């Protein structure tokens with residue numbers, strides 16, 4: 001349901017709150033959440 | 046490494062500037078010390 | 085009674101001489117051209133993806149400072165004065181930038197020429213980023229390596245330099261009068277001799293140096309003012325001068341209207 | 348020979364910093380510790 | 390956090406008038422004018438235009454605080470003339486001067502181009 | 503980090519002259535002569551280009567975090 | 570060739586209408 005990204009090989013996957021926190025392909029122990037989908041706006045000042 | 050073009054250009058500029066500084070500053074210092082000596 | 089004499093003329097700079105005007109009028113004209121002439125600049129940035137090494141607000145600030153063509157910005161409306169819903173074609177210009185690096189080696193530069201105008205006022209010459217030539221690349225915005233992409237949508241609005249310096253049409257306005265100091269408006273600091281310790285003005289040959297036997301003239305006032313107006317490219321120099329005059333006239337007419345309506 | 352200018356002194360100082368660095372005392376002390384001190388304490 | 394909005398320097402609130410005139414009863418024929426959302430650009434122009442009129446005996450302005458965009462003008466004229474009429478004449482005169490200045494600049498630019 | 507778009511003091515656009523400056527320095531021109539060639543007269547604008555350090559080249563050597 | 574290879578009398582003809590020890594040429598990588 002929620003996207004992640006591996007800290008080593010930059011691979012994208014998903015977790016279901018029951019898998020171990022690991023990369024699928026290279027088995028890194030460090031993963032990062034993906035950027036949101038909400039609209040992002042700045043005032044250019 | 047596959048260095049960028051700007052970085053390689055800056056490296057060449059740095060080598061040229063280092064050589065030019067090592068010549069000119071040393072020559073100016075030699076001129077200043079000989080002038081201070083002859084006084 | 086007021087006179088204008090032009091010394092050098094260019095698209096981006098004019099050097100003129102004002103005579104038979106008050107000092108206050110020339111200074112107010114300088115201030116108006118610096119802070120009150122309306123231009124067009126990017127004000128809202130919608131970021132759809134940004135995987136570069138630069139922060140989002142960093143890139144937004146850089147985008148705000150890019151000068152856009154503002155020739156027909158007088159026919160545009162202020163965003164707060166437009167009755168439209170959200171942004172329309174009569175109060176905003178929409179630009180879009182999409183950059184990416186293809187390949188696994190090297191670096192890609194993102195220039196202001198990559199900004200593409202998508203919508204804006206019909207038949208008005210506003211919105212396009214300023215470019216010196218046809219082969220000029222413009223202002224460096226960002227740098228991208230492999231798998232890094234930038235995809236943004238910008239909204240350009242009308243404003244003045246009082247709100248933010250990105251809307252200023254001018255960079256620097258040189259301003260000077262009385263090169264030989266006949267009015268004694270300044271008292272020259274010196275160690276031995278003030279005459280030979282101070283460099284001569286660049287307009288010193290445009291005025292006759294005072295005679296040695298001349299006495300101080302207390303009835304004189306500043307009369308001739310030299311000024312150079314340099315523009316960022318968003319407007320031409322003559323356009324900036326004319327619109328500064330027009331803005332000052334509009335402010336005075338508004339004061340007069342308020343006075344007459346006060347009764 | 349020829350005289351030694353200030354630029355020559357700065358060349359010598361550059362050689363010093365090329366060889367030693369700025370944190371050489373910390374690394375050298377720790378290396379001495381790990382290499383011999385643990386064995387001697389044991 | 391406590392920084393005011395930058396558009397407050399020149400945007401006039403709905404309930405705030407652009408111009409408020411009150412008499413100064415200490416001396417005869419004097420008024421105090423309060424200008425809102427204005428600064429030295431208009432103040433100095435109006436002051437030094439008015440100072441050259443023979444029937445204007447006193448003219449001055451002050452910006453009380455640089456963090457607030459307003460200035461206050463004091464104007465005193467002769468018995469025959471009213472200060473508001475002098476202010477209107479000054480505004481019209483500066484407008485005419487700017488008009489001829491713009492005309493001559495356009496003429497010279499067309500000549501030199 | 504990356505060359506500023508405008509001069510801090512006066513606001514002249516200096517962000518389009520970095521690559522030309524590096525080119526001129528490559529050709530062997532002195533820094534003052536190169537700045538003269540780029541029509542940067544006021545020393546406020548000369549300071550912007552003369553004292554800029556390009557840190558983005560170091561930041562770009564780290565591998566991208568998203569692919 | 571350069572200014573050094575020029576004849577001294579012709580060098581004297583080059584009159585402005587000497588380097589100083591405290592004006593260095595800028596660098597980017599430094600040393601250490």
Ligand SMILES: [Zn+2]
Pocket residue numbers: 006007008009010011023024025026027028
């Ligand atoms: Zn992985």
Ligand SMILES: [Zn+2]
Pocket residue numbers: 166167168169170171172173174175176
């Ligand atoms: Zn609208």
Ligand SMILES: [Zn+2]
Pocket residue numbers: 509510511512513514544546547548
């Ligand atoms: Zn500058």
